[PDB]
PDB file of C-alpha atoms in Angstrom:
ATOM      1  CA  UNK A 627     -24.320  -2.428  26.357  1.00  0.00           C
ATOM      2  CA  UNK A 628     -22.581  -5.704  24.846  1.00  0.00           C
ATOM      3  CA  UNK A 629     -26.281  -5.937  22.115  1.00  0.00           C
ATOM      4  CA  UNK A 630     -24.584  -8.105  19.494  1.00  0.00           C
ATOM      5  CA  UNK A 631     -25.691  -7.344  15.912  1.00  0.00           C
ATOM      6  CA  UNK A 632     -27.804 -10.111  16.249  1.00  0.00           C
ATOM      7  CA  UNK A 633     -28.112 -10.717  12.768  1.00  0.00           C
ATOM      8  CA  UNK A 634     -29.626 -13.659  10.535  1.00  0.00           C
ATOM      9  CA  UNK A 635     -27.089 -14.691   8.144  1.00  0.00           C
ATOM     10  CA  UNK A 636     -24.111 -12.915   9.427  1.00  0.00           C
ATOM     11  CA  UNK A 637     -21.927 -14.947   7.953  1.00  0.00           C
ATOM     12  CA  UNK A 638     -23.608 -13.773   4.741  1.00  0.00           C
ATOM     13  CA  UNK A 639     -23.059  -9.816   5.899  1.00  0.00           C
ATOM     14  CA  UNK A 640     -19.427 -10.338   6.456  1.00  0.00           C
ATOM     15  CA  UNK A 641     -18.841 -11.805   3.611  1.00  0.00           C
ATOM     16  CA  UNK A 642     -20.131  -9.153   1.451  1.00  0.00           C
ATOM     17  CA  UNK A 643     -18.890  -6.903   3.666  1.00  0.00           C
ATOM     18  CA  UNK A 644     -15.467  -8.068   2.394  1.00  0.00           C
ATOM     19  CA  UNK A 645     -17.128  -8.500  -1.371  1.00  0.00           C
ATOM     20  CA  UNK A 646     -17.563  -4.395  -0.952  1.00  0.00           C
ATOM     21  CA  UNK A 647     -14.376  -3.980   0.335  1.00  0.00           C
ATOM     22  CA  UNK A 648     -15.516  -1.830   3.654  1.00  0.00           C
ATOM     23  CA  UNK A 649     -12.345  -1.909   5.036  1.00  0.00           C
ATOM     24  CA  UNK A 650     -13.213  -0.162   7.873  1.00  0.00           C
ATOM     25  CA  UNK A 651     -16.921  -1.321   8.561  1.00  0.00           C
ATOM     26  CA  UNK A 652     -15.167  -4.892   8.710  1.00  0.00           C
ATOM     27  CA  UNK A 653     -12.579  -3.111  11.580  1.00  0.00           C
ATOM     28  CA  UNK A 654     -15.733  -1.608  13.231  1.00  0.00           C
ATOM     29  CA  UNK A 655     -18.131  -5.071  12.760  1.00  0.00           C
ATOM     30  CA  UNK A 656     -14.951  -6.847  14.568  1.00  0.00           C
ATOM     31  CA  UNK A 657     -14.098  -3.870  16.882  1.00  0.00           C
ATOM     32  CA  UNK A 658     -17.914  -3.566  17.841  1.00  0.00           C
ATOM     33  CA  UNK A 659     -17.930  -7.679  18.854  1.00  0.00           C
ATOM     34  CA  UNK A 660     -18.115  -9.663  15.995  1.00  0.00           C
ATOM     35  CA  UNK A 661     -17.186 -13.161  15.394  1.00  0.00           C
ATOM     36  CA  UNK A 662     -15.878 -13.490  11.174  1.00  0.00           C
ATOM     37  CA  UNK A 663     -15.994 -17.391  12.090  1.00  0.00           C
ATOM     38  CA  UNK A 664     -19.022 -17.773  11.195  1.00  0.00           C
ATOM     39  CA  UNK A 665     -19.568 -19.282   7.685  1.00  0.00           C
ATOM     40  CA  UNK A 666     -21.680 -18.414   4.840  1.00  0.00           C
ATOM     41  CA  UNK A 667     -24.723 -19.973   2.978  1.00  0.00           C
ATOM     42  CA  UNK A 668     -21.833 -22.022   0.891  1.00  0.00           C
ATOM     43  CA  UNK A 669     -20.101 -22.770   4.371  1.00  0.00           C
ATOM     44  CA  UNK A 670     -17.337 -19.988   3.654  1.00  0.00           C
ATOM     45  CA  UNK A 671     -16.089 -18.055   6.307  1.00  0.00           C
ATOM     46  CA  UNK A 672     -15.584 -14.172   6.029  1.00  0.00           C
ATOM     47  CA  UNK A 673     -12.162 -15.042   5.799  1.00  0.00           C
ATOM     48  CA  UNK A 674     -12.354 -17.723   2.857  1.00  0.00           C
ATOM     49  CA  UNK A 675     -13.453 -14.765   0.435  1.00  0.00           C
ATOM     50  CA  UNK A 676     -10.802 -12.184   2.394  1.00  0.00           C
ATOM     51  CA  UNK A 677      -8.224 -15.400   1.071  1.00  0.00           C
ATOM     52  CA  UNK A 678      -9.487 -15.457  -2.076  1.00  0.00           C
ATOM     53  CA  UNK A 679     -10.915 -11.615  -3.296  1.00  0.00           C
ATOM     54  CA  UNK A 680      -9.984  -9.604   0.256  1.00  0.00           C
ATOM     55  CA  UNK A 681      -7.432  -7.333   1.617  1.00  0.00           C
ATOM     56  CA  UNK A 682      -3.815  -8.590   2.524  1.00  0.00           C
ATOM     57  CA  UNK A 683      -4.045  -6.939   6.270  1.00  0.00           C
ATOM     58  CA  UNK A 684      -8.224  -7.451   5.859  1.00  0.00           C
ATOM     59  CA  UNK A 685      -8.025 -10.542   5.918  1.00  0.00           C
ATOM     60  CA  UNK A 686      -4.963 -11.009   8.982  1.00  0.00           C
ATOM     61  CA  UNK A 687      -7.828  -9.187  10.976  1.00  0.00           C
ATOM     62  CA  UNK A 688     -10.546 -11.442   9.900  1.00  0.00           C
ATOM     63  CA  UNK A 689      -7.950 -13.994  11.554  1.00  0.00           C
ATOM     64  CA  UNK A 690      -8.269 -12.448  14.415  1.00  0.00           C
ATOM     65  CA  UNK A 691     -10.432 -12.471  16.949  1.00  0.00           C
ATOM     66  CA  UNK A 692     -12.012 -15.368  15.644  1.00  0.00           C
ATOM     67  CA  UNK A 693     -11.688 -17.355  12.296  1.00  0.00           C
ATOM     68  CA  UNK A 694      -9.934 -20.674  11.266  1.00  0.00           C
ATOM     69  CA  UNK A 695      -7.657 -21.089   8.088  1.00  0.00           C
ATOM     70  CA  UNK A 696      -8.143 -24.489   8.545  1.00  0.00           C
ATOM     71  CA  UNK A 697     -11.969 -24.845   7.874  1.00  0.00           C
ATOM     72  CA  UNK A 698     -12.805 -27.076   5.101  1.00  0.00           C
ATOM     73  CA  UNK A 699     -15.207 -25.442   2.778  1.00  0.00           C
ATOM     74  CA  UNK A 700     -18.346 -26.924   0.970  1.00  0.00           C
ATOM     75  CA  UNK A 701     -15.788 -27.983  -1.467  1.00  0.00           C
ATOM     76  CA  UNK A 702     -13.222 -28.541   0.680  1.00  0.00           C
ATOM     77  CA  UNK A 703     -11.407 -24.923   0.002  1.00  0.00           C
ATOM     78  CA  UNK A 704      -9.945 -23.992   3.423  1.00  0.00           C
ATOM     79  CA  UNK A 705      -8.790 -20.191   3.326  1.00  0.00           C
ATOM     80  CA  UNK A 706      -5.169 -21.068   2.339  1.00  0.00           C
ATOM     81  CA  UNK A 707      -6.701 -23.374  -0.743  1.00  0.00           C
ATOM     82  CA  UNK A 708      -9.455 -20.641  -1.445  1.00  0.00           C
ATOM     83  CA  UNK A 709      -5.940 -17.806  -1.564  1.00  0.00           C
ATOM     84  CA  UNK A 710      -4.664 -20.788  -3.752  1.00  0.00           C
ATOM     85  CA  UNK A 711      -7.936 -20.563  -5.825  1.00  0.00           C
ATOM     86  CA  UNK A 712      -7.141 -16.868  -6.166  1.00  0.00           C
ATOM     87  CA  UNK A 713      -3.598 -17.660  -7.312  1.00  0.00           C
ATOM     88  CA  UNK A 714      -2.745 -14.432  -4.817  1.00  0.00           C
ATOM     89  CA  UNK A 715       0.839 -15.924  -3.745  1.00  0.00           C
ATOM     90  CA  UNK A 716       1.368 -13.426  -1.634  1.00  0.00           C
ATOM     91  CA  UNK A 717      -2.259 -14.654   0.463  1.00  0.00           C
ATOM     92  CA  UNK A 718      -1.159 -17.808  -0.189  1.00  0.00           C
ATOM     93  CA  UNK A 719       2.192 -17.188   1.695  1.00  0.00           C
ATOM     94  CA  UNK A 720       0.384 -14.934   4.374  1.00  0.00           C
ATOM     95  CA  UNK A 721      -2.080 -17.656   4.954  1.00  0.00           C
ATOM     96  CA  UNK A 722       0.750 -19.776   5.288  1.00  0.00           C
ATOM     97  CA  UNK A 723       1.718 -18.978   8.237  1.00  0.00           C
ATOM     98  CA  UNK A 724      -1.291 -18.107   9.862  1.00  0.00           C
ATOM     99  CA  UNK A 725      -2.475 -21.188   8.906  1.00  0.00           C
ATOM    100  CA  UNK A 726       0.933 -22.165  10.698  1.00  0.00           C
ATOM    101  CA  UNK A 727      -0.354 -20.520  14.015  1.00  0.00           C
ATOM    102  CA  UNK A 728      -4.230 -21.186  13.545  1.00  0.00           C
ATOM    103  CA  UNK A 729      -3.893 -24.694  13.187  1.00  0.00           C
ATOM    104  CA  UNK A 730      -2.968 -25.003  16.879  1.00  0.00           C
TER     105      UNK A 730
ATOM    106  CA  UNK B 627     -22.087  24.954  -2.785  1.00  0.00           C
ATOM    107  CA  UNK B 628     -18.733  23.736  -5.130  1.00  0.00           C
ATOM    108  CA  UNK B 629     -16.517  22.835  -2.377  1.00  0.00           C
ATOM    109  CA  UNK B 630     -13.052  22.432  -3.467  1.00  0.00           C
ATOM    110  CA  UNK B 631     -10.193  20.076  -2.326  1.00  0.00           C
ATOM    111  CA  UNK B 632      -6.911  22.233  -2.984  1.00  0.00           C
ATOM    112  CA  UNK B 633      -4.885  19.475  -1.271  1.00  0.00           C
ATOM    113  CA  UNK B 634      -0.993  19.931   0.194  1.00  0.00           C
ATOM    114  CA  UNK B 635       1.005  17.011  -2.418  1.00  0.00           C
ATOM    115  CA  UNK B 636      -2.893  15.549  -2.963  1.00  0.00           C
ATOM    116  CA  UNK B 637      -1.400  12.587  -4.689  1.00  0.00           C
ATOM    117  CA  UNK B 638       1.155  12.301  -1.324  1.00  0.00           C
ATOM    118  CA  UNK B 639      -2.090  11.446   0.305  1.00  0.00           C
ATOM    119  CA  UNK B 640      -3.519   9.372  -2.059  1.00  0.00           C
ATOM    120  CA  UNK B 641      -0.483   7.715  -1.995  1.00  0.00           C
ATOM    121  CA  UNK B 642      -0.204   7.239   1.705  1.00  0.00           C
ATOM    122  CA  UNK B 643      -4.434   6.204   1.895  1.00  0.00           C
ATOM    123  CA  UNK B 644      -3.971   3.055  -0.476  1.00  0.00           C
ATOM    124  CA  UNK B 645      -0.397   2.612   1.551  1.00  0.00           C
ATOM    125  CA  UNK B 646      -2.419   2.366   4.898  1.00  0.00           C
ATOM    126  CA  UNK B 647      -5.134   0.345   3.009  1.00  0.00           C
ATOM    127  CA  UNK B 648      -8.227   2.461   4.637  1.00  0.00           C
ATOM    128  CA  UNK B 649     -10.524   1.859   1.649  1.00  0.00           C
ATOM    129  CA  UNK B 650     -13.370   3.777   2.943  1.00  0.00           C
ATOM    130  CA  UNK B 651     -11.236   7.357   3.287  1.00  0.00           C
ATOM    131  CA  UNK B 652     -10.260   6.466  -0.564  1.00  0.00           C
ATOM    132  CA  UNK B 653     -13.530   6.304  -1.362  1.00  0.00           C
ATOM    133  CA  UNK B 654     -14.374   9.179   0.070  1.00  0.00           C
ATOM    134  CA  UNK B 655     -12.000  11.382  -1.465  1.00  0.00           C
ATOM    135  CA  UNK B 656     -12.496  10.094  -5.051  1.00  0.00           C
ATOM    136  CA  UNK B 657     -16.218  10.106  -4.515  1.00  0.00           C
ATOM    137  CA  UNK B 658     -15.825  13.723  -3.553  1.00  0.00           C
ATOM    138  CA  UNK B 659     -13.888  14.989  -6.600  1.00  0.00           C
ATOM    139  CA  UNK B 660     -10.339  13.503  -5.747  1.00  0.00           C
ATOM    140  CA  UNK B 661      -7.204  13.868  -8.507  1.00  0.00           C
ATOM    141  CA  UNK B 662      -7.092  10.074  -9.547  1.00  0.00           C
ATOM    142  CA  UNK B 663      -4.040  10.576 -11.604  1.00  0.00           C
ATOM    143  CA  UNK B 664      -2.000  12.500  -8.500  1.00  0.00           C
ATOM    144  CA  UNK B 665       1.842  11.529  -9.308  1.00  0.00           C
ATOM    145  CA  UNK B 666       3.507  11.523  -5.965  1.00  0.00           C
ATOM    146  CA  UNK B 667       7.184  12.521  -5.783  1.00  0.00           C
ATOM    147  CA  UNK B 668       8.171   9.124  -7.476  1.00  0.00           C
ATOM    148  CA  UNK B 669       5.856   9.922 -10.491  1.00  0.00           C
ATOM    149  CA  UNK B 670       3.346   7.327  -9.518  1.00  0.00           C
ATOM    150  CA  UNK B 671      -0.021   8.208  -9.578  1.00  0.00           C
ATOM    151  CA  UNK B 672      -2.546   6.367  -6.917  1.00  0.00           C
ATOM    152  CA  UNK B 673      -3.419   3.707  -9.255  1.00  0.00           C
ATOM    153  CA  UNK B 674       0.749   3.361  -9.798  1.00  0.00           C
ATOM    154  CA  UNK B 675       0.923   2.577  -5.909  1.00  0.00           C
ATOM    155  CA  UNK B 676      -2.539   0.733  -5.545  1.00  0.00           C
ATOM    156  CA  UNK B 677      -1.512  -1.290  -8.090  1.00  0.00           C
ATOM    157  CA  UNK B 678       2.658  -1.997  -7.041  1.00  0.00           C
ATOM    158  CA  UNK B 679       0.821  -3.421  -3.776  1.00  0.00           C
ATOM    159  CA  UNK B 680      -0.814  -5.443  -5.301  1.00  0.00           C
ATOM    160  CA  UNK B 681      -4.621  -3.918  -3.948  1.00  0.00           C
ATOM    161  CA  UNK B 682      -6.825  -4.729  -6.738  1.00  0.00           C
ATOM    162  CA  UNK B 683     -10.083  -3.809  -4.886  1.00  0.00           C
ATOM    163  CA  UNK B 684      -8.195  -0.295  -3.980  1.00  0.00           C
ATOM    164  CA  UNK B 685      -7.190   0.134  -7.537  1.00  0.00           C
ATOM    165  CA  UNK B 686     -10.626  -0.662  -8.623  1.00  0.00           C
ATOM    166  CA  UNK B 687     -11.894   1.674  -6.545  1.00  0.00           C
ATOM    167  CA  UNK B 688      -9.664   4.169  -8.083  1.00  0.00           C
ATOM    168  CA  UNK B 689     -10.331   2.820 -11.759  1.00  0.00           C
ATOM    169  CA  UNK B 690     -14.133   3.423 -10.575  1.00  0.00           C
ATOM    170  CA  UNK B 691     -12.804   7.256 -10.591  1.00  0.00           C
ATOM    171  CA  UNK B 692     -11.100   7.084 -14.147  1.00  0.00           C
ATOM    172  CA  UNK B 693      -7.101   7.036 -13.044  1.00  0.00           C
ATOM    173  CA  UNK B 694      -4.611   6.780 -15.776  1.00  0.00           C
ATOM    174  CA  UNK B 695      -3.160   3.384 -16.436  1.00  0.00           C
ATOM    175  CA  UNK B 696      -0.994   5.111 -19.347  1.00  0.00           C
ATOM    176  CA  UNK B 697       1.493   7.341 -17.554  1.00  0.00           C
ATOM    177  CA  UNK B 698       4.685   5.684 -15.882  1.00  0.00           C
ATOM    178  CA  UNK B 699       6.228   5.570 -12.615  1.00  0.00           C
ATOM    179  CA  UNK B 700       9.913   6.498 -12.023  1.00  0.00           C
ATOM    180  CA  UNK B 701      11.243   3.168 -12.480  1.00  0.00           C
ATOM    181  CA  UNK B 702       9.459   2.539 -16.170  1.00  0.00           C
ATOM    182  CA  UNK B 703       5.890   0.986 -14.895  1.00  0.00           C
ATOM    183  CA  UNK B 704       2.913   1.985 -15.732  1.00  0.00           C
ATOM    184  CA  UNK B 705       0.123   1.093 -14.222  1.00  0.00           C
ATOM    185  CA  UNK B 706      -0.657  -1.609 -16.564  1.00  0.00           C
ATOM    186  CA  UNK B 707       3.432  -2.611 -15.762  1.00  0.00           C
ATOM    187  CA  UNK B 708       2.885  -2.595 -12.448  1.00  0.00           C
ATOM    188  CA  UNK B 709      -0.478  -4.235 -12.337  1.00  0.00           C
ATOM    189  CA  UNK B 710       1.654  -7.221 -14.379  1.00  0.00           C
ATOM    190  CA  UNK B 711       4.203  -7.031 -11.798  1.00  0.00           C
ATOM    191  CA  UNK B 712       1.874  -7.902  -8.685  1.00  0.00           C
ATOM    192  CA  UNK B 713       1.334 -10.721 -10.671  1.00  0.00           C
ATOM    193  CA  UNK B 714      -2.866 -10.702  -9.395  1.00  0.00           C
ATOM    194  CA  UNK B 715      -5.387 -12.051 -12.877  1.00  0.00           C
ATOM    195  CA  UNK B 716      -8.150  -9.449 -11.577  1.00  0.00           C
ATOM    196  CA  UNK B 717      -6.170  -6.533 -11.711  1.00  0.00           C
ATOM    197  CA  UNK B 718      -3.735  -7.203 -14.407  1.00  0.00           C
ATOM    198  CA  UNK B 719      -6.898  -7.756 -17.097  1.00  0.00           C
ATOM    199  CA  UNK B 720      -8.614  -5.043 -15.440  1.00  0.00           C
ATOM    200  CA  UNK B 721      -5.830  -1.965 -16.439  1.00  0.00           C
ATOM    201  CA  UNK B 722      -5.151  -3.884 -19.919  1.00  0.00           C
ATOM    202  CA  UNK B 723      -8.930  -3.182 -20.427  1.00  0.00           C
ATOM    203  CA  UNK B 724      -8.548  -0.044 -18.988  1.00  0.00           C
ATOM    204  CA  UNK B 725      -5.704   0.927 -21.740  1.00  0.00           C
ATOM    205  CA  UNK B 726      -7.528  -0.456 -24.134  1.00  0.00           C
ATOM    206  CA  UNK B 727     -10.821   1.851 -23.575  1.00  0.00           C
ATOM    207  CA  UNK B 728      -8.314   4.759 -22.478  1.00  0.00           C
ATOM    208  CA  UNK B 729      -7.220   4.397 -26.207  1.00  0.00           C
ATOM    209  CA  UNK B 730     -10.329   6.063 -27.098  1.00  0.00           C
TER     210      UNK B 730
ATOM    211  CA  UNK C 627      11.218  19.516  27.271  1.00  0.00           C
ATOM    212  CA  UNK C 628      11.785  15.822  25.086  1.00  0.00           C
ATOM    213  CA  UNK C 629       9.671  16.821  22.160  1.00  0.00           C
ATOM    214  CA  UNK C 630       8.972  14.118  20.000  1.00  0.00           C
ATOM    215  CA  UNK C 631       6.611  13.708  16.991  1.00  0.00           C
ATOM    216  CA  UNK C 632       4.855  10.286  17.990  1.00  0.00           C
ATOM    217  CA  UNK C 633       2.930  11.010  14.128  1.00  0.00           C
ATOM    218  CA  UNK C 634       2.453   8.747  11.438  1.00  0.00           C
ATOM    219  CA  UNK C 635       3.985   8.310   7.874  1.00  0.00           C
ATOM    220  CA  UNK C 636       7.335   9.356   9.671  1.00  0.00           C
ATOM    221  CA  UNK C 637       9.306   8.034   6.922  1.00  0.00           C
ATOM    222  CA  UNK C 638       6.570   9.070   4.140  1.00  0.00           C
ATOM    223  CA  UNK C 639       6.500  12.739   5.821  1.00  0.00           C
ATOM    224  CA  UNK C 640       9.852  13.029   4.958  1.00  0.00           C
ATOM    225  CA  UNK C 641       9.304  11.663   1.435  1.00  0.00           C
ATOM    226  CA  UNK C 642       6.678  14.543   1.116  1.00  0.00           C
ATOM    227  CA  UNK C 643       9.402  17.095   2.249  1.00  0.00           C
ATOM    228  CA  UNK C 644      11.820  16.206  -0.219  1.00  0.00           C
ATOM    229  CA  UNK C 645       9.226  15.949  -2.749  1.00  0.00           C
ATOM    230  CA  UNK C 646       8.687  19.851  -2.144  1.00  0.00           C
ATOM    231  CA  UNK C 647      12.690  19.855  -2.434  1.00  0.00           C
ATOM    232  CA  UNK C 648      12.628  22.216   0.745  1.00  0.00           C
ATOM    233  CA  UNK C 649      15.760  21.766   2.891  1.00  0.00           C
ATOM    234  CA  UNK C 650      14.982  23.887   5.989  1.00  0.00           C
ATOM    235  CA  UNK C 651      11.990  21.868   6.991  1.00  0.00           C
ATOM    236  CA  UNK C 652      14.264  18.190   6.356  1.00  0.00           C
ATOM    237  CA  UNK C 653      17.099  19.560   8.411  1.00  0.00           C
ATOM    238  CA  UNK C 654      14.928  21.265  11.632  1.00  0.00           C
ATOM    239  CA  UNK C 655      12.858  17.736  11.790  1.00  0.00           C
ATOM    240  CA  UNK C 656      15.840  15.516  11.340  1.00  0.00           C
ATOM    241  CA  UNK C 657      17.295  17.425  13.899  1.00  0.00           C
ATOM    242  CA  UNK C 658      14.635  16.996  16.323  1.00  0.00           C
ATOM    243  CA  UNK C 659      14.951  13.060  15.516  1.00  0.00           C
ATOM    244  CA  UNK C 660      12.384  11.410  13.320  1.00  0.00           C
ATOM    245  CA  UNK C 661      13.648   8.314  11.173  1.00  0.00           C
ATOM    246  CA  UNK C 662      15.053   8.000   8.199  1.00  0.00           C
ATOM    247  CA  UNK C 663      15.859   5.076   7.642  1.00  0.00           C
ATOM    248  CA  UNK C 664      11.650   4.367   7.527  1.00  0.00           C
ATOM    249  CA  UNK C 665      10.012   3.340   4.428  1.00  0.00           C
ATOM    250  CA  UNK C 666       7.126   4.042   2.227  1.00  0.00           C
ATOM    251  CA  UNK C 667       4.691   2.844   0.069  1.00  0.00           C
ATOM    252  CA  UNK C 668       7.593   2.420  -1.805  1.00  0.00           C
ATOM    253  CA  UNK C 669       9.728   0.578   0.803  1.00  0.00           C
ATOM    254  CA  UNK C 670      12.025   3.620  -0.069  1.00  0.00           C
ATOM    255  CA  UNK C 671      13.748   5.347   2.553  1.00  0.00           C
ATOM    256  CA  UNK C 672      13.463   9.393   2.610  1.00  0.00           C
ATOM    257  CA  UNK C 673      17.347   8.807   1.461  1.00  0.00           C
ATOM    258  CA  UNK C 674      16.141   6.974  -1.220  1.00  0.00           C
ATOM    259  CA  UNK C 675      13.781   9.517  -2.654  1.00  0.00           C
ATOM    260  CA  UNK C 676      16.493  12.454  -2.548  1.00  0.00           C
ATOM    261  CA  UNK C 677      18.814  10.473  -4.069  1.00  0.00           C
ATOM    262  CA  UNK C 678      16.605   9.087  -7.017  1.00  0.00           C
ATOM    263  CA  UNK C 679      15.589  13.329  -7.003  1.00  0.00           C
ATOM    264  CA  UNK C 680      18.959  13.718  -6.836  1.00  0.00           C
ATOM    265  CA  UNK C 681      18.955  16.377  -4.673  1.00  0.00           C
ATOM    266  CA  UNK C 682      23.018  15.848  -3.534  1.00  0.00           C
ATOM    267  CA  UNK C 683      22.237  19.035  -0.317  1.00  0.00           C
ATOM    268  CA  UNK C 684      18.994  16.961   0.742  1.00  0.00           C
ATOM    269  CA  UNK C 685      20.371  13.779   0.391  1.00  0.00           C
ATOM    270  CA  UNK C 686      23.520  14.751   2.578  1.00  0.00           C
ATOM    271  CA  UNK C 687      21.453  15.520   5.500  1.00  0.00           C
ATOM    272  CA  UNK C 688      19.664  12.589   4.930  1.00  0.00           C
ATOM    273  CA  UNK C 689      22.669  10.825   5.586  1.00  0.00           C
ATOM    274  CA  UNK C 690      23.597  12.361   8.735  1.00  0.00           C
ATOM    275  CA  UNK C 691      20.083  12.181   9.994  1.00  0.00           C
ATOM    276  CA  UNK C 692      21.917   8.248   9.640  1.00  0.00           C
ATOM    277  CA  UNK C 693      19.536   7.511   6.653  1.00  0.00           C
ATOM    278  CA  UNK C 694      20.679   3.657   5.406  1.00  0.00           C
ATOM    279  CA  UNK C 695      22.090   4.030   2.171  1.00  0.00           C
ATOM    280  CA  UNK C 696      22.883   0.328   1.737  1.00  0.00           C
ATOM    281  CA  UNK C 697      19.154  -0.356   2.415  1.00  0.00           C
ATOM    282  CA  UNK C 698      17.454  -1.359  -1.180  1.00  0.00           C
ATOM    283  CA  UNK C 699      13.564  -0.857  -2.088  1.00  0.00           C
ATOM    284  CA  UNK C 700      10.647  -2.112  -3.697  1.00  0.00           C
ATOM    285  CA  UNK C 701      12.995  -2.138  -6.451  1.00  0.00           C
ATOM    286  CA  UNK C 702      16.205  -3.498  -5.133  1.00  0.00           C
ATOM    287  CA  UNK C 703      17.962  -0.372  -5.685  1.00  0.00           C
ATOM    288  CA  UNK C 704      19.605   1.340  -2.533  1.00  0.00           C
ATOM    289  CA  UNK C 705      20.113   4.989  -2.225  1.00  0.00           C
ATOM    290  CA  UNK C 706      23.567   4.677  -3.940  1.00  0.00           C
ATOM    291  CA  UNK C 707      21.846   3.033  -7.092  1.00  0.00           C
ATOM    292  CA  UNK C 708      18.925   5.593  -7.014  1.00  0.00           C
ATOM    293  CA  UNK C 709      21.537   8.163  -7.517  1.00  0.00           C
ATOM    294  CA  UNK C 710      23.252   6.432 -10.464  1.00  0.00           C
ATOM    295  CA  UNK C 711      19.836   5.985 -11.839  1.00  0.00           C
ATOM    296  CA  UNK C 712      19.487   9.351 -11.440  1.00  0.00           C
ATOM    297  CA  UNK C 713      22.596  10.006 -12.908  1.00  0.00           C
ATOM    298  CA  UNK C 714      23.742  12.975  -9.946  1.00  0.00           C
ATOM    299  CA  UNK C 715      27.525  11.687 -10.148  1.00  0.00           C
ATOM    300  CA  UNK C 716      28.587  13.714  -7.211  1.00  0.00           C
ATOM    301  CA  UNK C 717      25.519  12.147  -5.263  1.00  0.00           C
ATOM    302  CA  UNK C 718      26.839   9.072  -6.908  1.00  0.00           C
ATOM    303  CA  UNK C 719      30.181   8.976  -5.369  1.00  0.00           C
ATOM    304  CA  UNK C 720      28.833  10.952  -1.553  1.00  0.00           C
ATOM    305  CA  UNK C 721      26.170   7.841  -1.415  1.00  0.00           C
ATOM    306  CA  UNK C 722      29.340   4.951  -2.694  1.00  0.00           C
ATOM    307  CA  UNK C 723      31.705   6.023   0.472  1.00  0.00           C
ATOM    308  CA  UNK C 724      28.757   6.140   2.991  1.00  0.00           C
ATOM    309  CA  UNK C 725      27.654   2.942   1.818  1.00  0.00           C
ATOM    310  CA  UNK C 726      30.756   1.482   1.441  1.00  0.00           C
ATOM    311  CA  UNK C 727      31.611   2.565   4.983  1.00  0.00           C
ATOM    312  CA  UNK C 728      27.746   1.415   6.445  1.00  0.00           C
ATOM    313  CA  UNK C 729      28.047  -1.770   4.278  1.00  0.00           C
ATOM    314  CA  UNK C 730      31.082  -2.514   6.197  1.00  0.00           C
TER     315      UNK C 730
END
């Protein structure tokens, strides 16, 4: 049909969607035709809080398909700054070098 | 009706769930009366593996369903240990609170 | 007729076998050619788990499945230092001369 989900605030949605942890609704909200780029009421993207309180391989799907590493927050607190916020090295390094290929 | 689970090596699939990182199955086998202190063949109980990951959100999911945080794996880690050792805040304070109220 | 298992969890299946400590099943599917030098949750081979089980007749066939016994784990130690950790000298010294020889 190719109906979008058409919803207000979807950055909001996805974003909670990762704050609940729906692993799988976030496969099926991307699978379905979804774009995680779009950021939140405090400019975050889906993938900002994937960096800083999301899944290792959540968030590497949130970067694809549509999301930027690279995008400045309110704050200033790109994805690889917000993992850095989180202190989760092993986001941090992740988001490294995605950031690496995103960049581009 | 009392369904029952009477799983093959339950805590094999646990195991394998939180290894795949499909947090919606997880959920649904906790939420339905799952064994959240399964040890697996390496003595490691779901919230052993969530937690040697590094998954906080999986192992607080899992805490959510009461797993042990006092038993140890095969190579001397508790959950608690191992929570240390992926070296994430959340989940590290959340299984030293978890020993502390397992105490009682 | 080229049967091949094309499953998941090849490597973790295999874990699950030994965990039963069931030889007949490890030797008919190693035989028909699934991996064993995959690894788990645990980034432990199936060789790894028999020889921290210590189960000298399951890790054998392990080893001529062509199991890696100079590949470490999670924990750095390699089927070889399972077994000493285990404290199966005979697996001890079987697991030293096929590392020694896959080493070199």
């Amino acid at each position: 049909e190719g109906a979008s989900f058409n919803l207000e605030d979807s950055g909001n949605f996805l974003c909670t969607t990762v704050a609940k942890g729906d692993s799988d609704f976030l496969k099926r909200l991307l699978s379905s035709g979804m774009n995680p780029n779009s950021e939140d009421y405090d400019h975050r993207t889906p993938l900002h809080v994937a960096a800083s309180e999301g899944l290792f391989l959540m968030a590497k799907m949130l970067v694809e398909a549509g999301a930027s590493v690279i995008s400045k927050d309110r704050w200033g607190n790109s994805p690889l700054d917000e993992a850095r916020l989180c202190g989760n090295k092993k986001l941090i390094k992740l988001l490294e070098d995605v950031k690496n290929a995103q960049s581009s």
